[PDB]
């Protein structure tokens, strides 16, 4: 199936992103980084690999906050490059990666506008993977209703709002309900897109996107217990893609304690091993750490094919995890808290 068309438009970008996939820190690379004693050594070790010169032309008194920014700067330049070079079948897929960041940027814009702040002050805080081309929303910024109309005109997000959130909803709902409701519409739409890109894309993407839908449902459930969210508000936010959708999604929505959530994970042996594999006790890996670990084990399956878009999405989420890893190593070193330095996730 895919080989009739895939290399016609994507063969170069596939070879490029696979090149960037060779350019990753192995377990053996992390087992160098964690041995060193200061950010000057961290620079000198990272200097030996694809991160070379990421801290060039920068202040000698390094801070973990500068390392964080320059790690992301590499990732976002590589992504913007692949998005500029891609043709519409892939480029629409790469756009689907960027919505997961534009949602969070829109949450800042709505938050500042609801507090009457000028959006021009929020621009430097927006994630580079979600920066807009059209700016009249940013330039005008006058009221939440004006921003909502400007979003529908300017932003690719406009379709998601029309499916789930009116202007009147934006005036009343909390911004974190907005974040997850937009995300619900997003993940389901992107999963539908990946089911329409049948064969190798669908078979690489659906295991990941179905896991992300389950992951939101599990995590939102255990986080909701201490909160004003009703069982109906949980049900309104769980994404309908994941293996739980036929029943476990409703069972989570009814659930109100960790054991009742494990009673859903017990029906799905992957998830049973994730919850069994973390009590979140002192010195344990946490439930969250197992979700990040498993998401990496799924993203590692993307490169076991040759002709599909699953590599681009998995690559972004792996380099994102590489940034989170190197920042977490840099914190443990800078603060001397070596006792938890091993908690990075071994990407490849």
């Amino acid at each position: 199936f895919p080989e009739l068309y895939f290399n016609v438009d994507n063969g170069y970008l596939e070879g490029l992103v696979r090149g960037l996939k060779a350019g990753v820190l192995s377990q053996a690379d992390y087992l160098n980084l964690v041995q060193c004693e200061t950010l000057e050594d961290l620079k000198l070790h990272l200097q030996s690999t694809d991160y070379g010169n990421f801290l060039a032309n920068e202040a000698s008194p390094l801070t973990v906050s500068v390392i964080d920014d320059k790690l992301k700067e590499k990732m976002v330049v590589e992504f913007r490059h692949m998005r500029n070079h891609a043709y519409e079948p892939l480029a629409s897929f790469l756009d689907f990666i960027t919505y997961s960041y534009m949602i969070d940027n829109v949450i800042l814009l709505i938050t500042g506008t609801l507090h009457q702040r000028s959006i021009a002050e929020l621009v430097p805080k927006c994630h580079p993977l979600g920066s807009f081309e059209q700016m009249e929303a940013v330039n005008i910024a006058q009221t939440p209703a004006e921003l909502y109309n400007a979003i529908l005109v300017d932003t690719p997000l406009a379709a998601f709002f029309q499916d789930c959130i009116s202007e009147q909803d934006l005036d009343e709902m909390n911004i974190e309900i907005i974040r997850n409701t937009l995300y619900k519409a997003y993940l389901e739409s992107f999963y539908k897109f990946c089911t329409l890109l049948g064969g190798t894309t669908a078979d690489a993407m659906c295991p990941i996107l179905e896991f992300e839908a389950d992951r939101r449902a599990f995590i939102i459930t255990i986080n909701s217990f201490g909160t004003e969210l009703s069982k109906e508000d949980r049900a309104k936010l769980f994404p309908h893609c994941g293996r739980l959708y036929p029943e476990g999604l409703a069972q989570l929505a009814r659930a109100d304690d960790y054991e009742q959530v494990k009673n859903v994970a017990d029906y799905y042996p992957e998830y049973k091993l994730l919850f069994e594999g973390a009590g979140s006790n002192p010195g344990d890996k946490t439930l969250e750490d197992r979700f990040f670990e498993h998401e990496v084990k799924l993203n590692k399956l993307a490169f076991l094919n040759q002709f599909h878009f699953g590599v681009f999405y998995a690559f972004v989420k792996l380099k994102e995890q590489e940034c989170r890893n190197i920042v977490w190593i840099a914190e443990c070193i800078a603060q001397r808290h070596r006792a938890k330095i091993d908690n990075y996730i071994p990407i490849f």
Partner: protein, 150 residues
């Protein structure tokens, strides 16, 4: 006397009766078997009860067999051509009606099984709807019996 090609249409009668019925029952079994497999995950109790659509889809294969055998055992070299057209008419009247019924059993069996996972009271409703699906094979059998013996 009777045309040399005549038995070709009678053969396509028998063949269609079995072939399109096997496609109908295969679709019925594939879609409902998928629904059972997905439903079983959180329902060890319902796995046996849920076989209803699967076995019912098998009936369409048997209506196809009945007509196919009934035609096939009625073939001869001398066949009057009129009898061969009756046998085509029969073999399609069951065969494609069994395809229709198999579609309905497949879709209904899948949905009915998943809905029964969510709500065990649906088990009766599923049986009733599957009857209104399955009878489309039976009406195709009736017409094909009438035609294959007119």
């Amino acid at each position: 006397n009777n045309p040399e090609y005549s038995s070709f249409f009678g053969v396509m009668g028998a063949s269609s009766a079995m072939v399109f019925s096997a496609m109908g029952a295969a679709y019925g079994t594939a879609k409902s078997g998928t629904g059972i497999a997905a439903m079983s995950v959180m329902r060890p109790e319902l796995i046996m009860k849920s076989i209803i659509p699967v076995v019912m889809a098998g009936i369409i294969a048997i209506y196809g067999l009945v007509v196919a055998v009934l035609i096939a055992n009625s073939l001869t070299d001398g066949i009057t051509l009129y009898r061969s057209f009756l046998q085509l008419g029969a073999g399609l009247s069951v065969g494609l009606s069994g395809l229709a019924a198999g579609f309905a059993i497949g879709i209904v069996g899948d949905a009915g099984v998943r809905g029964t996972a969510q709500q065990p009271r649906l088990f009766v409703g599923m049986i009733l709807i599957l009857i209104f699906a399955e009878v489309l094979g039976l009406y195709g059998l009736i017409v094909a019996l009438i035609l294959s013996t007119k």
